[PDB]
Every structure is written in structure tokens, then in C-alpha cells.
Design a protein around this ligand. Structure first.
Ligand SMILES: CCCCCCCC/C=C\CCCCCCCC(=O)O[C@@H](COC(=O)CCCCCCCCCCCCCCC)COP(=O)([O-])OCC[N+](C)(C)C
Ligand SMILES: CCCCCCCC/C=C\CCCCCCCC(=O)O[C@@H](COC(=O)CCCCCCCCCCCCCCC)COP(=O)([O-])OCC[N+](C)(C)C
Ligand SMILES: CCCCCCCC/C=C\CCCCCCCC(=O)O[C@@H](COC(=O)CCCCCCCCCCCCCCC)COP(=O)([O-])OCC[N+](C)(C)C
Ligand SMILES: CCCCCCCC/C=C\CCCCCCCC(=O)O[C@@H](COC(=O)CCCCCCCCCCCCCCC)COP(=O)([O-])OCC[N+](C)(C)C
Ligand SMILES: CCCCCCCC/C=C\CCCCCCCC(=O)O[C@@H](COC(=O)CCCCCCCCCCCCCCC)COP(=O)([O-])OCC[N+](C)(C)C
Ligand SMILES: CCCCCCCC/C=C\CCCCCCCC(=O)O[C@@H](COC(=O)CCCCCCCCCCCCCCC)COP(=O)([O-])OCC[N+](C)(C)C
Ligand SMILES: *[C@@H]1O[C@H](CO)[C@@H](O[C@@H]2O[C@H](CO)[C@@H](O)[C@H](O)[C@H]2NC(C)=O)[C@H](O)[C@H]1NC(C)=O
Ligand SMILES: CC(C)CCC[C@@H](C)[C@H]1CC[C@H]2[C@@H]3CC=C4C[C@@H](O)CC[C@]4(C)[C@H]3CC[C@]12C
Ligand SMILES: [Ca+2]
Lengths: 1061, 256, 40
């Protein structure tokens, strides 16, 4: 009925892959051209697989351009990068098994890797059979995933079973071509293994030389079709190559005919007649008679008769003319090529075919490189394009590089960079805009760019659009340099070519190209962290939007790869030098919007990076802000309230560093005869007054202060709640309020201010975004809840009425829970208690599921119990709704914990519990017994099993989560007010004065920034090469490479055995 | 501002690894020896990696002992246990691929395992190209952890892009030596893969046999430097070895 | 006895056997190249 729904532009395999032009048919025999009868498909009778080979009969005067239109558009055949024309012997011939195997490996490898068409005679005999058999036992071995297109251009007057293919109407697309030959026809059948058929009519029958004209005119037609590519410089004309196995004089005529149309020829020696003659004619010597751009005519005084007799081996009538044609084909050294089995070891026939085309384009190296790009074969580029003989520059490789970038040829781009391309000269602004202009369509960036330039009505892409998209993919007030830097508006080169091409690579989701560009870059660690941020943020963008296709798991996996690379570079930097690696983490990076590597590693939630030893030691050093590493809590606690002891007993960073340097200067002797980050990571010294303010400014001293102040608050709030909270009466002084409660108001007001400034100092600059990120962590719910609950209690307090006063004191006496439970955050700075408090919140899910199942059993038993004990109307009916509803829930619940109401649920306790029905007196213990089996000795023991199962799994991850949360902890206490808990509110004012007047990083010198970039880059190189040597040295790869060398030994011995024989 | 704190005598890689002597320059052409204009470093245009190759132009009458003092002290170049002098053909020649591969395995393995200097002509043609290519595809394969020191002793009258390397003031340490040859000079360029350059002035231009004297007098100077060791018996004089690939009668004269 | 047993243990690991086998295969390949040179 209607079209079935396939996920278009999301998955690969659509169901389309699984009423005509002129198409004249001469059917009179003098000739009357009618519409064709034979143009469906052929299902060959059971040679393996389901393969329908479309065909078409057509007259000999049909123009080739229409046939190209029929192939490309109507048949849905892809535009090839190569065309292999296989000519040879019509009658069947024998190949030697080694050469046969080498032939059918070479031809199919060339066709599969290049993406080529193979044009042949079509019939079931001669060379066509060898090509068919090659295709058969290369598709039976590896399957049909890269389908090789074989075109059979045959004649209609010879093919068997014509009546089978004929139908006057339309719809011949099922056809059943049998293999049993019709008795007494004298004419070949079609080959089962060919993919497409062109059947040439002439009216006549039993005539062989009909398809010779159409073959040539088609081969002309696919030399002016341009190849498919994104660049307009990469679209070359399709190269054709000719392959020869045998034949008479006719193949040599065809060879010389097509050489004059600039088509090279490969002749296979170790085969039959014409190939061996032309080959052994080529095999003698070399001789340039005239210069003539390297011409050959191998006919000295010595070896004319040998060629005369070898031509005279077959055919006497016109030995001179065929010998003339044999010496004519050897004119151009570049055109003709001869493959012999005893030439080389490492040269297969596919290399002979492709190197013949490279030899055909020997004049211009640019054409050779374009062919090498078009085929996507870098071994040829390494072989005979980039040699010691010829030199490449930026100006010559510009077009090739742009083609390599736009068509996702990562290995070529790598190779051009490391040979003679310099990206400082190559990348201009127009090239970069052209790179973003030609994004694929199936990517995530294309909708985003279209939506951005859709608003504000701009028809042409520029770097302001790309900048704004990069800005909104990094939400924490990121500022891309495209929006501000003068080089990216519209000659001197761009500031960072490698970076912005790398950003283009990661935004297009090109894995190999991004890796190639990452390895040749200035800041590997920062780039990797920015990449992972971009990838996983656009992954979530792709996931939650309906008008963008879901490729989210691919983007998360790519983000994970860049996360591993960032950690690897950090690990190598840490192993070389532990101190300067921590300096490397706090560098103020200019190209990443003044943002440091630690902040980039927090923006993208990279737990593996923050959990690394270098980051953890750095966080401990930042926690000990400008203070000696082994200063204990009590020493700080004493010095916090006695600031005269601040100088003698507290050591500092300059003191220990001076001691270490003073020691290390002595070890070299012979044995005989707001500036906290600066003073942490420089050789700066502190006076007297500096090291007072630096002590109070340290996060750890603020933490110790916070703990002491918090203890004071809890004791104060516990006192007022337990001992002295009277009711308000206007008669007494102050309302009879104890000063304690006013001191409590003061401290709660201080906590309120702290939460206000915690809201105000968030990374986004939008009040909604501040609030949204403020309610990300679950502590702030408890904070604002407890503070709101407190303010409501104190508002209700003053009214002088017993009911709402009771409400006031109850609300305070329950708020103590939340203020005390809030202590667990100050307990979570510990190495041991911290991870445990993460493990608890991960077990809350299993507790929630347990309580749901328990609640179902509880309520079932409860309703049954109460119904049986106390009948619904009657003498024993308790006449009260609320106690009934609460009793159903109440008594089953307490009975879990061993509070069995055995006296109560039976006859006894008539006054306390209530008198029970006579039949309830014996039902109640029985129902209790069943309930106690299914609750205590089933569910509770099952809950123990659930917790032990999940504890190991959570144990692995909860530590990393604690490691990651240490950054927020340090950053929180870094920004807290300077002064101590008693005066902390006075300290808070100084932040208000600073704010009304209108950080963990260091700014390095240009020389130091250069030095740090060089050291980081060398560390990245060490990581990259170690990973290559790790992946190469695996046991499976050693065995595989060992197998390849054993095959090389076997081939060498075969050549030795050939040299013997 | 102040010096950044690195853990000295604890970890290996310090940031030091990552206002001159006489240094006469004949620039009149009869000769007036001025202070040199060309002594910074060369950032070659994008052949992989970040490698600044320091260089220096100097007159043909400069004493070799000062050049040794410049290498060992000023450039922070370690005292070698071997010196390989590669002489041969000036014009480009072809090696058979097995012998080519065997050559570039042997030379770099000897240099890496021994801890040696390789002294060559410096230019981008002949045997110097083979030594350069050897260093390139042995450092592209295994990285630069054991850096092979290749010294290019070339002449200043032949090298291309002289105006690129020249600066009257101090501070030429960033320099951008391009690979595209200037049209119609008739003289070679510097090799991208060499680590250090000594450029011999004579005042003249387009003359080849300028660096023959300095080459020998430097090779004399590093036969009397003692090797670094804790023992006073282990400090031997640095051995020099000569390696030949091709040449005319001139290489055989140099050999003898 | 302990020292030599540890040497024979570290040498007889699967990875070391495959690595040494690779070295002997390279020696065979070089010998055949010289045989092919002796033919030509
Ligand atoms: C009058 C009494 C004043 C007492 C002040 C205590 C000072 C606490 C700070 C402290 O000791 O630091 C400890 C850290 O580890 C922790 O802080 C883990 C949590 C324990 C501290 C909270 C104790 C309970 C008080 C709150 C209860 C709230 C109310 C609960 C109501 C139910 C130890 O630090 P350190 O090891 O010596 O540091 C040196 C090494 N380092 C720098 C490399 C790390
Ligand atoms: C054991 C583990 C402890 C766990 C914490 C236990 C929680 C409680 C501890 C925390 C709150 C602190 C309460 C004690 C301080 C008040 C003393 C007081 O009531 O004053 C009394 C005199 O002074 C008595 O010494 C006078 O009392 P008033 O007339 O009412 O004024
Ligand atoms: C009457 C009403 C009284 C209701 C009282 C219930 C008060 C409920 C309090 C809810 C807050 C707990 C979650 C805290 C949190 O933000 O998660 C953090 C982890 O937290 C942990 O470390 C584990 C927390 C377990 C506490 C379980 C509740 C305590 C009940 C005490 C029972 C006492 C008996 C009460 C009677 C992490 O957050 P994030 O990673 O940063 O995001
Ligand atoms: C956390 C628990 C909520 C704390 C809220 C605390 C704020 C409470 C403010 C209202 C207090 C009113 C008290 C009152 O008027 O007492 C009258 C008598 O009360 C009784 O005898 C019990 C009647 C049932 C009470 C409501 C259901 C309680 C269980 C369900 C409660 C849910 C008179
Ligand atoms: C109602 C209120 C009742 C009163 C309660 C008041 C109690 C007052 C408590 C006062 C004592 C506080 C001691 C804190 C120091 C802990 C030990 C320590 O140094 O931590 C170390 C670990 O130690 C474990 O191995 C290091 O910890 P880390 O560096 O963080 O890793
Ligand atoms: C107090 C009364 C006791 C019952 C109530 C208190 C028990 C805790 C309530 C849990 C709320 C749901 C919840 O958080 O999901 C949890 C899973 O559970 C589910 O996803 C099942 C969804 C049905 C929830 C309705 C249960 C009805 C309880 C009434 C049962 C019938 C009577 C876990 O969520 P998470 O996201 O995976 O982490
Ligand atoms: C609950 O109310 C019911 C109905 O008013 C009471 O049941 C009556 O109790 C009296 C006195 O024992 C009997 O004489 C009646 O026969 C009962 N009524 C019926 C319909 O059977 C019952 O007493 C009340 N229960 C409580 C605990 O107060
Ligand atoms: C643990 C195994 C053996 C199951 C035990 C089930 C027992 C505890 C259950 C099943 C039947 C129940 C009994 C059923 C009848 C009576 C008679 C009278 O006295 C009231 C309670 C009493 C005595 C019940 C007590 C609890 C009871 C005995
Ligand atoms: Ca808070």
C-alpha cells in the first residue's frame, strides 16, 4: 500500500538497493528498428547466491552516451575510479596454476580496492571464463560486500536460448537462463558470473565481429566522465587500462588501436600466443634510436631472425604485417607494459595494472598523485610518487591536501604533512570557510550550523557562525577566538592552523583525521579535553532533539577515545617530572579562552583525568594553600584563635623549598676535603604580615574554622531546642526571649548569606542558569529547605497563641534533623568516610525497591488482621475511622522488629488494645506466623543478599566519584570569606565591598609558555609511540607477522626451484 | 617573574633542555671582519615535529678550539664517545634498496647506541641527503628520545635564502626557513633533518671548496677532547671514524 | 640452581619463544636473499 518506513539518513542499508529510452532492435534480416524485447534480469540456474544480472539488447548504431546514461542513472551503477578492459583469446586456453592463482588474486584485488568496472566479452569461453571463475571463487571465499561490477559486451546473434530472454511486453525482470546448451547451435552461452550484459544486435546471426565497434565507443564514452568527489580539483577523468592474456593478430591490432587513444596496456607472459610473442619481443633489451621522448625499437643486428621465426610459429599469411604491428606497440616505453612471473617477488598483477597507469602519466607528477588519491591507495604514493628523485612543496600539494581533507583521506593528509606540506602556508581563511561550507549532511554539526545561520538571516557561512556554535557547545561562559581575533574576518598566516583544522575534524566526527591532526598539534592535553567536551555535548544534543538523527553512542565512544588520550599524555608527563606536570595542569591557556586544563577536565565530566595521581596531589597542594604540607589540624586550630603563634610554629612553602634547595646545593659537593598561586609555584618569599593573611586565606584554615563554628551552632541550637524556648508575651522585657535565640538568628542569617553568595558565584551568567546549576547537587535542596523551614518557624513564633506556638516549636524541633544531617558533608573530606557516604546514596535505590514490595505485604496483612480482630459493624467494631486507618499500617510494621503483640492480638488487654472478636483470637497468631515467615526470614535476608551483590560494583565507582568531588570541595573553600567562624559574617562584608566596587591558575611568560609547550609535546610523542609499540607487540600480531614472513620464504624458494628448472 | 619551581635532583626532565664570543664575519668582497648577523635557530617548514636547529656563520680563519667551546658550553651539547665523518659524492646518486636500508639502519644504530656525533656537508644533495633521510625515517619510526646530533659544516656563499637568516641585532632564535627554492641561484639549500649548522664565510659567493679547511681543523679539535667518566683512567681521547659512499679523486685525497 | 631455573623460566615464556622464532625466520630470509644473489 503506502511506502514502508525505513530510518533514512540514520542507518546504511536501505531497501532500494535490493518506461525506457530509445533502445533500437534490428529484427528483420532488410532492417526495421523496433523497440527491444529483451531488457530484464537473469537468474542463472543455481550457481550459489541470489544474484540478478540486468541485461539489454541494442543495435550497433546506438550512441555510447545513452549507454552511460543507462548505466549511471537507470541501473543505479556507481561512477568508477578505474576501468579494466580484458581482451585475449576467444577459444579456451590453459594457465599454469601459479599464474592462474596470481591472475585471479590480482584482478579482483585491483577491482575491489580501487572500486572499478571490469569490461569483458560476456560469453562463457576463453579469457571471459577466467574472469568469471576469478569473480566466482573470490566471492564464494569472502562473500559479496564489495561487489565487483563485471560488464559483458556480447553479440545477440550468437548467444543461446534467445527465446528465453524475449518478451514483447514490459516486465521481463524475472528470467531463468539454464546452463544446458541447446543441441546444435554453434554459438556460445552467457557467463554465469558477470553482473551486467550488453547484447549487440545486427539483424544477422552466427557472426562474431559485431561487438568490436560498441566496445571501443563505450571505452571512449567512459574516458570523459568525471570521478565523484567533493573538491572540483579532485574530479579527474576516469582512467582506462587494458589487460592481455592471449589472442591472434586481432588483439595486437586492438592493442595498437587503443594505445593511440592514450590507453596503456598490460601483457601477461607465461600464457598463450600473442601475449608471449609481444612479451618476448619486449623482453630482449632497450634501445633509443632517436631521442623522441624515450622511444623503443628493439631490433638490432643480433635478434631479428628470432622474432621473425617466433612470429612465424603461428600464421604465415601476413607475417610481415603482424610483425609490423608487434614492433609498432613497443614504440612508447610508457604505454606498453609486460608482466612476467620471474620478474620480481613483491610485484603482483594489481601493482602492474596500477603502476602501468602511473607509468602512462609519467610527465606530470600531479596527475599521478590525483590518480593515487582517487584510488585511495597510499602504498603507491609511498612507492613511486614520493621518492628521493622528485620534490614536493606547499604550492604543488595544496589542491591534493584540500582534496584529501574534504574526501576523508586521513592517511594521505598525514603523508602530505610529513613530506612537504606546511599548514602555516596552506591554510588561509577562504580554505577554512570552504572546509566548513562543504560539511557532509549526515553529521550533527550541519543542523546546528543551519539553525545558527537560519536566525539573523545570513546566506554565506563564516567563522562568526562557527564560533557561536562552538560557544553554545561549551556553556560555561566559553569565548571562541573566532568572535574576537582580527584574522578571522572579511597576507599574514593564521595564528593556529593545526587547532582550527583539528576542531573542524572533531566537529565532523572524523576519527582518523582528528587523530592525525591531534598528533601534530601544540597542546595535546588541552585539545583532547576540549574534543571530548565537544563530542559528548553534541552527543547529548543529538540524543534529546527529534530534528537531529541519533548517532549518540558513536559520539560518546569517540569522546571516550579522546579522554583516554588526555589521561595518557598526563601520565607520561607525570612519569618524567611530577612537579612541572602539576604546573602544566594550572597553565592559563590563551587559545582556550583563558581556561586551564583542570577546568577543561571538569567541564567535560572526565573522572579518569581528575582521579589521576597528578591531579589528586595538585588538589592536596591547593588545599594546603601557601602553607607547609605536614601542618596538622590542631596546629591550625591553635593558630586560628591565637594569631601571635602564627609566625613561630606554622611553616610555609618558601621555607621547605629553601631548605630543599639549600640541601641539594650541598649534595653536589665532593665527599673528600591574591598571589597565592604565585608563591606556591614560584621562588617568592613571605615577610611577617604577608604570612598572616596567607595563613587565613588558605582553604584548610577556612575549613577548620568552618568546623569549629558549625559545632558551636549545633550546641547552641540544641540548647535552645532542648532547654529554653519559651512563648512570646508582650508583658516581659524583650518578649521574655533569652539572648541565645538572638545569637541563633545571627548564625542562621550568616548561613543564609553563604547560600546566597554560593548561588551568585556560579559559572553561567543567567539567573535561571545559575539556579539550574545551583540545584544540580542534592545538598542545596536540603540547605534551602532547612533555611526556609527555620524562617517560617521564627515568623510563626511571635503571635502569642498556643496552637501556632506549638506549630513553631515542633517545626524547630524537627529542623534539628536536617541541620545535623548536613554535617555529613564536613565528614566527607576524610579519605575513608568520604567513599562510604557515596556508597550509601547508591544503595538508596535498592532500599526504595525493597520498601515498595514490603509495603504491599504490610498493607495486605494489615487489612486482613484488623478486619478479622475487629468486625466491621457490631459489638467489637471500634467506632473510629482514623485509628482504623492508622492501626492497619501501625501494628504490622512494629511486628517486623520483634514487637509481637501476642497478648494484645489474642484475648488479653481489653482496656489498652481493645476487646477482640472470639474468632479473631485464634486467626491473629496464625496470620502473624505466616507474615513473619515471608517478612523476617525471606525479604530481610534477601535485602542482605542485594546489598552484598551491589557493594562490590559500587565499591569500584564510588571512589572515582569521591576523587572527582574533591575539585568542587577545594574550589568551594577557595572562594569562602577569609575571616574565622565567630567574625565570618564581618568577613562576608568585604566580599560585598569588593562586589559593589566592581582564580586557581598562573600566568606564565612567553618564554616559559614556549618551554612548557615543547615539553608537553615531547611527552605526547612518547605516549603515541609507546601505544604503537604496545599494539604491535601483542601475541596475535607477532604470529600474524610471522605468518607473512613464512609466506615470503615460501615464494623465494619457489623462485629458486624455478631457477633450478 | 621569578623562576618557576621544578623538583631539582628528584625528577629527570627539567625545562632547561626545552652575548657571544669573537665570531668574525667577512662581509665586504677587500675583507672587513664584522660581528655576525646569522646565529639563531631554524624552524624548517613542516617536516614533522618541533625541532629548532641552531646555526652559526663564521670566517674561515676561526680557531677550532673556540668552536668546541661553543658546542660544549654555549649550545649545551654533550661530549661524544665517537665522531662519524661522512664524506662522498656532492651530486645526488642512487643506492640499491637493500644497501640503502642497511646503510640507514647501520649509521643510526651506531650513533644511537654509542652516543656519537655525525659530521656532514650540511646541504640538501648527495650523501648529506642520505644521512638526512636516514635520520628522518628513523626518528619518524621510533620518536626522538635518544637524539642523534648531526653537524652540518657548510659554506655561506652557496646556501639559499641568506636574507631570511640575517639580522643585525641580537635575537634571531625564531627563523622560518622555507623549502621552495629561489628561482635562478645555482646553489644548494640546507638539509631539513640536520641538528646543528656551521656556515663558513669567505666573503665570496658561488665557490664550493670553502669548508674543506674548517672540516679538517674541527676534526683535529675533537681528537684531543677527553671523554666524560668518573675514573681518570676511563677518560680516553674521542675516536673519529670516516665513512665513504662515492666521490671523485677528491674523496681519495681526503681519505689519504 | 635457583638463578639458572629463573633464567630458564623467563626464557621459556610463550612471548619470548615467539620473539626468538621471529629472529630465526629473519635469519632464514637473509640467507635465501644471499642464495638468490649467488644465483644472479
Ligand atoms: C573544640 C573542638 C574543635 C574540633 C575541630 C576539628 C577540626 C577538623 C579538621 C581536621 O581535623 O582535619 C582532619 C581532616 O579530616 C577531616 O576533617 C574528616 C572529618 C573529621 C572532622 C570533623 C570532626 C567532628 C566535628 C564536626 C561535627 C559536626 C557536628 C555533628 C553533630 C552531630 C585532619 O587533617 P590532617 O590530617 O591533620 O592534615 C594534615 C595532612 N594533609 C593536609 C595532607 C591532609
Ligand atoms: C554524651 C554525648 C553527648 C551527645 C550530645 C547530647 C545532646 C545534648 C548536648 C548538646 C547541647 C549542649 C547542652 C549542654 C549545655 C547546657 C547546660 C545547661 O543546661 O545549663 C544548666 C547549667 O549548666 C550546666 O552545666 C542550667 O540549665 P537551664 O536552667 O535550663 O539554663
Ligand atoms: C519528621 C521528618 C524528619 C525527616 C528526616 C529525614 C531527612 C532526610 C535528609 C535527606 C538528605 C540526604 C541526602 C544528602 C545528599 O544531598 O546526598 C549526598 C550523599 O548523602 C549521603 O552521604 C548519604 C545520605 C543518607 C542520609 C539518609 C537520611 C538521614 C535520615 C536520618 C534519620 C533520623 C530520624 C529522623 C526522624 C550527595 O549529594 P551530591 O552528590 O552532592 O548531589
Ligand atoms: C513530618 C511529619 C509532619 C510534621 C508537621 C508538623 C506541623 C504540625 C502543625 C499542626 C499541629 C496541630 C496540633 C493540634 O492541633 O493538635 C490537635 C490534636 O492532635 C491529635 O491528637 C492527633 C490528630 C492527628 C494529627 C494529624 C495526623 C498526624 C499523622 C500524619 C502527619 C503527616 C488538637
Ligand atoms: C553532639 C556533638 C558531640 C561532640 C562531638 C565532637 C567531636 C570533636 C572531634 C575532635 C577530634 C577531631 C579529630 C579529627 C582528626 C581525625 C584523625 C585524622 O587526622 O585524620 C586522618 C585519618 O585518620 C584515620 O585514619 C587523615 O584524614 P584525611 O587527611 O582527611 O584523609
Ligand atoms: C510511605 C509508604 C511506603 C511506600 C512509599 C515510600 C517508598 C519510596 C517511594 C519511591 C518512589 C518511586 C521511586 O523513587 O522509584 C524507585 C523504584 O520504584 C519504581 O520505580 C516503581 C514505580 C512505582 C512507585 C509507586 C510506589 C507506590 C508505593 C505504595 C505501594 C502500594 C501500597 C527508585 O527510584 P530510582 O530512580 O531508580 O533511584
Ligand atoms: C460501636 O458502635 C456499635 C453500634 O452502636 C456498638 O454496638 C452495640 O453495642 C451494644 C452494647 O454492647 C449492643 O447492645 C448492641 O447490640 C450493639 N449493636 C449492634 C448493632 O450489634 C458498639 O458497642 C460500639 N463499640 C465500641 C467499642 O464503642
Ligand atoms: C514453625 C512451624 C512449626 C509453624 C508453626 C505455626 C504455629 C506457630 C501457628 C500455626 C497455627 C497457629 C495456632 C492456631 C490455633 C491456636 C489455638 C489458640 O491457642 C490460639 C493460637 C493458636 C495456638 C495458634 C498459635 C500459632 C500457631 C500454632
Ligand atoms: Ca550549599
Amino acid at each position: 500500500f503506502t511506502p514502508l518506513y525505513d530510518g533514512g539518513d540514520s542507518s546504511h542499508v536501505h531497501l532500494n538497493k535490493f518506461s525506457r529510452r530509445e533502445c533500437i532492435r534490428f529484427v528483420p534480416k532488410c532492417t526495421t528498428k523496433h523497440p527491444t524485447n529483451a531488457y530484464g534480469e537473469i537468474d542463472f540456474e543455481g550457481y550459489g547466491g541470489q544474484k540478478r544480472a540486468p541485461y539489454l539488447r541494442m543495435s550497433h548504431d546506438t550512441d555510447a552516451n545513452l549507454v552511460i546514461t543507462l548505466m549511471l542513472k537507470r541501473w543505479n551503477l556507481e561512477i568508477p575510479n578505474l576501468v579494466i578492459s580484458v581482451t585475449g583469446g576467444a577459444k579456451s586456453f590453459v594457465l599454469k596454476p601459479r599464474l592462474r592463482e596470481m591472475f585471479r588474486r590480482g584482478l579482483i584485488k585491483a577491482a575491489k580496492t580501487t572500486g572499478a568496472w571490469i569490461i569483458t566479452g560476456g560469453t562463457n569461453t576463453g579469457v571471459m571464463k577466467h574472469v568469471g571463475e576469478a569473480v566466482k571463487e573470490q566471492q564464494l571465499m569472502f562473500g559479496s560486500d564489495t561487489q565487483v561490477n563485471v560488464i559483458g559486451i556480447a553479440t545477440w546473434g550468437i548467444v543461446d536460448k534467445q527465446s528465453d530472454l524475449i518478451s514483447e511486453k514490459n516486465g521481463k525482470y524475472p528470467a531463468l537462463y539454464s546452463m544446458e546448451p541447446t543441441p546444435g547451435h554453434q554459438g556460445a552461452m552467457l557467463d554465469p558470473n558477470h553482473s551486467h550484459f550488453f547484447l549487440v544486435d545486427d539483424g544477422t546471426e552466427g557472426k562474431y565481429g559485431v561487438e568490436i565497434g560498441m566496445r571501443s565507443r563505450i571505452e571512449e564514452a567512459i574516458m570523459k566522465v568525471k570521478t565523484d568527489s567533493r573538491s572540483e580539483a579532485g574530479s579527474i577523468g576516469v582512467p582506462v587500462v587494458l589487460l592481455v592474456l592471449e589472442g591472434g593478430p586481432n588483439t595486437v591490432a586492438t592493442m595498437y588501436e587503443l594505445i593511440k587513444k592514450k590507453v596503456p596496456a598490460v601483457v601477461i607472459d607465461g600464457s598463450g600466443r600473442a601475449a608471449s610473442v609481444v612479451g618476448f619481443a619486449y623482453n630482449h633489451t632497450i634501445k633509443r634510436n632517436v631521442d623522441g621522448q624515450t622511444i623503443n625499437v628493439i631490433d638490432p643486428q643480433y635478434e631479428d631472425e628470432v622474432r621473425a621465426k617466433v612470429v612465424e610459429v603461428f600464421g604465415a599469411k601476413g607475417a610481415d604485417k603482424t610483425y609490423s604491428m608487434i614492433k609498432d606497440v613497443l614504440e612508447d616505453e610508457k604505454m606498453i607494459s609486460v608482466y612476467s612471473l620471474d620478474g620480481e617477488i613483491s610485484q603482483d598483477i594489481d601493482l602492474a595494472i596500477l603502476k602501468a597507469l602511473l607509468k602512462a602519466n609519467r610527465s606530470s607528477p600531479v596527475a599521478q598523485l590525483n590518480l593515487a588519491l582517487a584510488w585511495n591507495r597510499i602504498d603507491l604514493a609511498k612507492s613511486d610518487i614520493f621518492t628521493e628523485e622528485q620534490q614536493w612543496t606547499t604550492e604543488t600539494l595544496s589542491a591534493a591536501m584540500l582534496t584529501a581533507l574534504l574526501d576523508d583521506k586521513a592517511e594521505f593528509a598525514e603523508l602530505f604533512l610529513q613530506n612537504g606540506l606546511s599548514m602555516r602556508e596552506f591554510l588561509s581563511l577562504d580554505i577554512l570557510c570552504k572546509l566548513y561550507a562543504e560539511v557532509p549532511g549526515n553529521t550533527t554539526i550541519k543542523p546546528l550550523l543551519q539553525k545558527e545561520m537560519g536566525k539573523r538571516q545570513v546566506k554565506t557561512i563564516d567563522m562568526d557562525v562557527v564560533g557561536e556554535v562552538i560557544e553554545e557547545l561549551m556553556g560555561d561562559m566559553f569565548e571562541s577566538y573566532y568572535r574576537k581575533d582580527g584574522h578571522y574576518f572579511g597576507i599574514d598566516p593564521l595564528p593556529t592552523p593545526y587547532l582550527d583544522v583539528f576542531l573542524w575534524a572533531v566537529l565532523c566526527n572524523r576519527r582518523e583525521l582528528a587523530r592525525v591532526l591531534w598528533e601534530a598539534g601544540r597542546e595535546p592535553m588541552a585539545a583532547a579535553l576540549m574534543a571530548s567536551r565537544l563530542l559528548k555535548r553534541m552527543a547529548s544534543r543529538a540524543q534529546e532533539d527529534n530534528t537531529i538523527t541519533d548517532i549518540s553512542s558513536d559520539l560518546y565512544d569517540h569522546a571516550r577515545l579522546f579522554e583516554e588520550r588526555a589521561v595518557g599524555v598526563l601520565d607520561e608527563c607525570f612519569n618524567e617530572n611530577e612537579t612541572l606536570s602539576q604546573t602544566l595542569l594550572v597553565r592559563e591557556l590563551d587559545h582556550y579562552s583563558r581556561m586551564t586544563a583542570l577546568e577543561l577536565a571538569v567541564s567535560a565530566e572526565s573522572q579518569d583525568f581528575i582521579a589521576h595521581t597528578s591531579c589528586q596531589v595538585l588538589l592536596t597542594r591547593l588545599w594546603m594553600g601557601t602553607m607547609a604540607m605536614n601542618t596538622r589540624w590542631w596546629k591550625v586550630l591553635v593558630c586560628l584563635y591565637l594569631p601571635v603563634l602564627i609566625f613561630p610554629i606554622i611553616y610555609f612553602v618558601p621555607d621547605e623549598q629553601h631548605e630543599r634547595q639549600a640541601a641539594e646545593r650541598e649534595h653536589q659537593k665532593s665527599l673528600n676535603q591574591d598571589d597565592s598561586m604565585e608563591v606556591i609555584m614560584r621562588n617568592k618569599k613571605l615577610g611577617f604580615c604577608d604570612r598572616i593573611m596567607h595563613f587565613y586565606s588558605a582553604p584548610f584554615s577556612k575549613f577548620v574554622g568552618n568546623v569549629v563554628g558549625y559545632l558551636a551552632f549545633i550546641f547552641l541550637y540544641a540548647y535552645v531546642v532542648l532547654f529554653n524556648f519559651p512563648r512570646f508575651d508582650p508583658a516581659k522585657t524583650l518578649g521574655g526571649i533569652h539572648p541565645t535565640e538572638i545569637v541563633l538568628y545571627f548564625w542562621v542569617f550568616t548561613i543564609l548569606i553563604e547560600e546566597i553568595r554560593q548561588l551568585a558565584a556560579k559559572p553561567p551568567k543567567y539567573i535561571k542558569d545559575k539556579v539550574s546549576v545551583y540545584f544540580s547537587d542534592t545538598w542545596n535542596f536540603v540547605d534551602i529547605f532547612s533555611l526556609t523551614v527555620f524562617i517560617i518557624a521564627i515568623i510563626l513564633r511571635f503571635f502569642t497563641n498556643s496552637r501556632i506556638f506549638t506549630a513553631s516549636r515542633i517545626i524547630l524541633s524537627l529542623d534539628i534533623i536536617f541541620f545535623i544531617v548536613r554535617s555529613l558533608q564536613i565528614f566527607s573530606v576524610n579519605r575513608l568516610l568520604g567513599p562510604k557516604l557515596v556508597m550509601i546514596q547508591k544503595m538508596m535505590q535498592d532500599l526504595a525497591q525493597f520498601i515498595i514490595i514490603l509495603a504491599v505485604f504490610t498493607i495486605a496483612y494489615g487489612i486482613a488482621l484488623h478486619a478479622v480482630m475487629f468486625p466491621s459493624p457490631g459489638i467489637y467494631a471500634r467506632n473510629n475511622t482514623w485509628v482504623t486507618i492508622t492501626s492497619v499500617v501501625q501494628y504490622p510494621y512494629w511486628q517486623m522488629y520483634g514487637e509481637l503483640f501476642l497478648d494484645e492480638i489474642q484475648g488479653e488487654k481489653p482496656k489498652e488494645f481493645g476487646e477482640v472478636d472470639p474468632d479473631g483470637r485464634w486467626l491473629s497468631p496464625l496470620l502473624l506466623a505466616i507474615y513473619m515467615v515471608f517478612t523476617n526470614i525471606l525479604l530481610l535476608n534477601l535485602l542482605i543478599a542485594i546489598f552484598n551483590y551491589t557493594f562490590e560494583r559500587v565499591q569500584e565507582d564510588s571512589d572515582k566519584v569521591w576523587k572527582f568531588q574533591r575539585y568542587d570541595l577545594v574550589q568551594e573553600y577557595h572562594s569562602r570569606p577569609v575571616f574565622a567562624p565567630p567574625l565570618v559574617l564581618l568577613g562576608h562584608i568585604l566580599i560585598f565591598i569588593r562586589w559593589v566596587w566592581r582564580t586557581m591558575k598562573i600566568g606564565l611568560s612567553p618564554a616559559e609558555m614556549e618551554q612548557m609547550d615543547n615539553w608537553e609535546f615531547q611527552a605526547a610523542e612518547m605516549y603515541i609511540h609507546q601505544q604503537q609499540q604496545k599494539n604491535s607487540g601483542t601475541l596475535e600480531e607477532r604470529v600474524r607477522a610471522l605468518g607473512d614472513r613464512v609466506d615470503c620464504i615460501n615464494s623465494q624458494l619457489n623462485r629458486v626451484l624455478d631457477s633450478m628448472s
